[PDB]
Design a protein around this ligand. Structure first.
Ligand code: CL
Ligand code: CL
Ligand code: ZN
Ligand code: ZN
Lengths: 401, 400
C-alpha cells in the first residue's frame, strides 16, 4: 500500500487550508489537497484542525499525583511557599519507593498523551534524601514510554547546591545515569550565592556536555539580576542556545526598563524561557517577549502534588488558562498562545527541525474536534485522535497503544 | 413512595455520604440508607452531588454571534466597551426574532449540560433592538422552564442619557414582564451619575422590580459610582434589592476606599457579581467574602462581540477564578465553590428554596468527582442533571 496512514480533511493553521496528509512509517510524506492512492489505515479529521504534538516544556513527573487519595487534596490546608514545599518533598522522598515514583511518572505521561502532548521535559529531584532513586525510576519509566511520548530529563538540584552539600556529587551521578540536562534553583534567595551556584552549574554541564534548565522564580530586580548573570555566563562559557530559564516571574514586577535593557542580552545569549500556566503572573509581558523575538514556551509545572494542587496535563486547557491570566481576546493573541504550546516549545526543547506538519517531518500529530487554534482554546473540545511515530496511540479518549 | 432516589451521594455541607429521596419537585429524605427500591434511581457512586450552579450574569440574547467561521468573528480588533456597543447596534439592526430565540435556547442547553439550573440574563434595550430582543428572550424563557430558571434584566445598554428613547423602551420591557432593571456606567457612559441612578430607581419603583447595574468603570470613579448607588439604595427603601455587576474598580482603587465603603454595602444589603471572563487578578474576592459581602459569579457574555470565550460551565469558571486570583488552599477553593452555588442563589433571591436539604427544591447535579475541590481541579464532566425532581441530563445528553 502506498501509505501506511492518511489523515483526511485536515485543516492546517500554518497554511490556512484543508489537506490530506499521507504518512509512511514515522514520517510525513505527502500533504496535498486530495491524496490518490491505496492506504492501510485512515482517519477523517472532517475539516477540523490537525496540529503537531503539544509541547509541555516543564513538568515534575517524579512527584506528581502525590496529593491524590482522599476526599480533599492532601497538603493544601496551608498556603504555598517554596521552602515549605521543599520540606514536604524531603519528607515524601524519605519513604517513597522506586515503583510508586515509576507509577506516578507513567500516570502523568498517559494523562499528557490523552491530551495530545507528545513531548515533555521533566525535572527530577536530586538531593540527599531522594539521592538518585527518583532519577532511576524516571529513566526506567521513560524507556517504557518511548512509543507514547518523548521525554527530556533534567537533573534538578531542588534543595540548592550550597544548602545541601551532597548535591554536586549526586547530580554528577545522575548525569552519568543519562539525564539530558542539568539545573538548579534560585541562585539568590535559595543558594545565597549567585556567582558560585551558577558557575558550578556550568561546570557540571560542560563535564557531561548537557544543556541547562534553571528554576529562577525570585521576583523583582533580584530575579532579573540573576537571569542577567546567567545569560552573561552563558556567553562566557560558549553555551549560546543551550540554556533555558524556567518561570522568570520577575519579568512581571521588575521595572519594565530592566527588561527592555536585558532583551538584547537574552537574544545575544540565545536565552530560552518557559512560563508555566499554573503560575504565569497576570502582568507577565508574554506578548511583548514574543514580539521582541524571544523564545518562550509553556508548561504544566507540577501536577497534583505539594507545590501545585491543580493539573490535567492538558496544554489546550493551559492555553485557555493563559488567555485568562493575561486577559487576551484577539485572534492574533490567541494564535501566539497556540504557538507557545507548539512550535515555541519545540524550539525550547531543541527539536524544531523535525517539528511541524510539513513534508519530511515526524508523523507526531493531534486531530482535534475544533475548527482552529482559536476555537480549540475557546471550546476546549476533547481530542479526536493522537498519532505518535505514524501510529495511532489515542482514539476516542482511550490509549490504544 | 419516592419518584426518584439518588444513591451514594457525597454532600459537602454534611461531609458524608447519603441517599436522597425525592417526590415531585422536592427533597423529602436524606438518610444514610433509604429502604426500598423505586423505578427511577441514580447512583452517584460516592461522588459529590451539588445543588444546581448559579450563573448570575449572562447575555443570552446576543450569545454565539461570534460563531460561524474558521476564526471567531469580531476579534481582529481589541475590546473596548464603546466599540462593542456599536457592534451590538449594527448586529441588532437586521437580527430576527427567531435567530435571537435560537441563540437563547442554545445558550440555555449549553448551561444545563454543565449543571447550571439558574441564570440571570440581561437583554439589550435601546433604539435599534427596541423590545425585539426582550420579546424573543421572554418567549424562549417560557419554552425553557422545565430546564432552567431565568431572570431577565431590562438593560439599557446604550445609556439612558445617551440614547434618549431608552426610558420608554425600558418601561415597555418591564410591562412585557422583565424581572429586573439596570443600566451601565453612570460616570463614563452616561456622563451623569445622580440622574442615571435616580431614573433607574424611579423605573424600578414604578414596576416594583429589583435592580442589577453594570458598573465596570475602574478606579475611584467606579467606587464612587457604587457608593452613590448604595446610598440611594437606602434612601429609596431598596435594601437587599440591588446588585452591582462587575465592580472591577475594587481591584485598582486604593484599598482604603473599599475598607470605608464595606459598612455602607452591608447597611444597604448591596449584592455583587464578578464574571470569570473578567474578574481582575487583584480583585479582593476572598476579602469581600470574609467581610460577609454577598458575591456571586457568572459567565458574562458567551461567544459574541464583547467576549469570544465561553462554555457556560461554572465549574470551568471556578478553575478560571483560582488561576486569575492565584488560589490553591482547600479553604479558598471552597469559597469559590460557594460563589458558583449558594452565593449566586442569594444574589438571585432564591436562598430559601436552595440547597441539598429536606424541604428544598430537587434541582441537583451529580458530579464525577469526589469534592468541590477535586471537581474544580479535575474538571470531570457532569454525570447527571436533575431539575424539578426530573432527570434532564444524562451522559452529556439532554434527555428532557
Ligand atoms: Cl554572588
Ligand atoms: Cl453627577
Ligand atoms: Zn518547576
Ligand atoms: Zn454584562
Amino acid at each position: 500500500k502506498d501509505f501506511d496512514l492518511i489523515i483526511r480533511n485536515a485543516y492546517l493553521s500554518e497554511k490556512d487550508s484543508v489537506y490530506d496528509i499521507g504518512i509512511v512509517g514515522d514520517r510525513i510524506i505527502k500533504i496535498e489537497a486530495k491524496i490518490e492512492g491505496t492506504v492501510k489505515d485512515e482517519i477523517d479529521a472532517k475539516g477540523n484542525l490537525v496540529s503537531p504534538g503539544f509541547v509541555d516544556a516543564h513538568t515534575h513527573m517524579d512527584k506528581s499525583f502525590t496529593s491524590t487519595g482522599e476526599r480533599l487534596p492532601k497538603f493544601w490546608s496551608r498556603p504555598y511557599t517554596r521552602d515549605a514545599a521543599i520540606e514536604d518533598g524531603l519528607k515524601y522522598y524519605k519513604n517513597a519507593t522506586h515503583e510508586e515514583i515509576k507509577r506516578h511518572v507513567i500516570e502523568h505521561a498517559h494523562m499528557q498523551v490523552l491530551h495530545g502532548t507528545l513531548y515533555t521535559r521533566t525535572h527530577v529531584d536530586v538531593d540527599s534524601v531522594a539521592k538518585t532513586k527518583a532519577v532511576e525510576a524516571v529513566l526506567e519509566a521513560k524507556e517504557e514510554l518511548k512509543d507514547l511520548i518523548d521525554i527530556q530529563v533534567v537533573a534538578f538540584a531542588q534543595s540548592g547546591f550550597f544548602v545541601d552539600l551532597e548535591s554536586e556529587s549526586l547530580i554528577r551521578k545522575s548525569l552519568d545515569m543519562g539525564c539530558d540536562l542539568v539545573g538548579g534553583v534560585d541562585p539568590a534567595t535559595r543558594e545565597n550565592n549567585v556567582e558560585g551556584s551558577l558557575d558550578l552549574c556550568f561546570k557540571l554541564a560542560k563535564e557531561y556536555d548537557v544543556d541547562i534548565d534553571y528554576h529562577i522564580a525570585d521576583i523583582g530586580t533580584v530575579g532579573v539580576y540573576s537571569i542577567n548573570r546567567l545569560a552573561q555566563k552563558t556567553i562566557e562559557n560558549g553555551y549560546k542556545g543551550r540554556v533555558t530559564t524556567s518561570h522568570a516571574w520577575c519579568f512581571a514586577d521588575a521595572p519594565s526598563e530592566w527588561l527592555d535593557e536585558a532583551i538584547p542580552l537574552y537574544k545575544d545569549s540565545g536565552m530560552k524561557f518557559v512560563t508555566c500556566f499554573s503560575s504565569t503572573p497576570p502582568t507577565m509581558p508574554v506578548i511583548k517577549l514574543l514580539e521582541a523575538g524571544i523564545n518562550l514556551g509553556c508548561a504544566s509545572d507540577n501536577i497534583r502534588d505539594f507545590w501545585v494542587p491543580f493539573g490535567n496535563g492538558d496544554m489546550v486547557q493551559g492555553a485557555l488558562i493563559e488567555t485568562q491570566r493575561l486577559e487576551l481576546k484577539t485572534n492574533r493573541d490567541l494564535g501566539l498562545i497556540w504557538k507557545m504550546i507548539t512550535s515555541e516549545g519545540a524550539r525550547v526543547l531543541g527539536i524544531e527541525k523535525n517539528y511541524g506538519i510539513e513534508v519530511g517531518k515526524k508523523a507526531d500529530l493531534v486531530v482535534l474536534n475544533s475548527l482552529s487554534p482559536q476555537w480549540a482554546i475557546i471550546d476546549q473540545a476533547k481530542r479526536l485522535c493522537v498519532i505518535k511515530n505514524g501510529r495511532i496511540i489515542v482514539k476516542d479518549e482511550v490509549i490504544v497503544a
